[PDB]
């Protein structure tokens, strides 16, 4: 009837000396073997409760939704955010920010374009730039970032940036580096001992300087918007929000500038670096499994044809591609420990008691890798999402977007980018590398808050 069991901690160090040099996750995986699906680890001074397996995670996020809906914090970025912006917002600030953030994808501008259409145009620009490389080896990183970021900017600032633009390439670089520093080994140790490390040089200081610098750009852009603002013809997200700041009198209110900047920062960042990451991994996987690429190509050829651009409508008619995409995300396993939650009350769980405000990780990646749902789960295989006839077999253990109240509000957009971008690129190209399939190493560089694929060279060969 106490906190869940786990390794016995030491005062001032916690469970430091039972961890696993590999990582926070590899550590937690070892503990799971000993203590089962629900257990307690002391990350430095605090207890944090781990939940593993799809049954436990659903039980928490869905069945006990009200209790498990709070947001914890990530030590590396907390000094920057400190509770502002939808990702790290709690209580009413979150209720407000979330509602707003959702109803501004799901509610699109009267005259302005569709979400699909924004993506469909991007994809073109992209193919019209892959051709302009005339088949050269390149690192796709900067481009995969470029296309996903332009989808947000489109909604947020009402516009896009050119792939060969400088200030733009500098920004996307601040994102990439920040995300990787958070996912770094220091970044993990920082989770454990931020209290002490705060006072010394290290990545945390860079992640701050980066966040400040992006936020500065957003800030200026907000100022520019406020000047040219038209009360009865809003251009984008920013305009919409500036018009809710119509609530200047109503007295104690959640639409601060701090929220504006921080919220936007929050979206850009999440919407840019996670899809881009998935795509990046997608194409590495295609290099290692050309048979899959070819079989996806065939379906595109057999359902869409070689000319007309793919569209969302086609998705129903083409299961193999969908299954491949699902498998990419499942295997990409982008947010292994999800993002930290907290319990909003003294909370009863499988006979244990988790006190109000205890941090709770939902080890999402124990779901995606459950052997009971995926034969040989360590291995990349589209079959995982197909029945006996090659029809799409959805499964309730596929939760890369988490569940319940906090669940990704980009799911719609992401699943649309992954489909359109993937199939459009493949429609017009085929993949080549100097490296052989047998020799392609999938092992990530960085494996922390986020799984970051190893850095690779690829070429795009017109079809
Ligand atoms: C395949 C790509 C993506 C994956 C795997 C993914 C995954 C996740 C996960 C695991 C969470 C936290 C779940 C939890 O709270 O327990 C989350 C939340 C969030 N995602 Fe995504 N995401 C993706 C793409 C996107 C996109 C396209 C956007 C659009 C802006 C986005 C914006 C957000 C935001 C703002 C949150 C915080 C939601 C909240 O706390 O209320 N993400 N996502
Ligand atoms: C789902 C979510 N979105 C997000 C948004 C902003 C910031 Cl600073 C960090 C994140 C965060 C992330 C991420 C991966 C790099 C894209 C994080 F790191 F805080 F956990 O995850
Ligand atoms: O508040 C905790 C004080 C002790 C911190 C010392 C550890 C800091 C992280 C690396 C190993 C030593």
Author numbering: 28 to 277, 279 to 491
The authors write:
The cytochrome P450 (CYP) enzymes found on the membrane of the endoplasmic reticulum are a superfamily of heme-containing monooxygenases involved in the biotransformation of drugs and other xenobiotics. CYP2B6 shares at least 75% amino acid sequence identity with other members of the subfamily, constitutes up to 10% of the functional CYP enzymes in human liver, and is responsible for the metabolism of 10–12% of all drugs currently available on the market. CYP2B6 is the major catalyst of efavirenz oxidation and conversion to the most abundant metabolite 8-hydroxyefavirenz, which is then glucuronidated. CYP2B6 also plays an important role in the bioactivation of many procarcinogens and environmental toxicants such as polychlorinated biphenyls, chlorpyrifos, and polybrominated diphenyl ethers.
The CYP2B6 used for expression, purification, structure determination and any other work in this study includes engineered mutations Y226H and K262R in the N-terminally truncated and modified construct with a His-tag at the C-terminus. Because of the relatively low-affinity binding of efavirenz itself, the 2-desoxo-2-methyl analog that demonstrated high-affinity binding (KS = 0.21 ± 0.06 μM) was used for the structural studies reported here. The 2-desoxo-2-methyl analog contains a methyl group in place of the carbonyl oxygen in efavirenz. Interestingly, the chlorine of the efavirenz analog 2-desoxo-2-methyl (abbreviated as I for convenience) forms a π bond with F108 in a similar fashion to that illustrated in our recent study using monoterpenes. The orientation of the methyl group towards the heme-iron corroborates the putative metabolic transformation at the oxazinone ring shown more recently by Cox and Bumpus. The trifluoro group was located near the I101 and F115 side chains, whereas the cyclopropyl group was placed between the side chains of F206 and T302. The CYP2B6-I structure adopted a closed conformation that is similar to the α-pinene complex. The phenyl ring of F297 rotates ~90° to make room for the chloro group of the analog. The F297 side chain is pushed away by more than 2 Å, in contrast to the amlodipine complex, and is likely to accommodate the chlorine group of I that is involved in the π-interactions with the F108 aromatic ring. And observed in the current structure, the R262 side chain may play a crucial role in hydrogen bonding with neighboring helices, which could impact the enzyme structure and function.
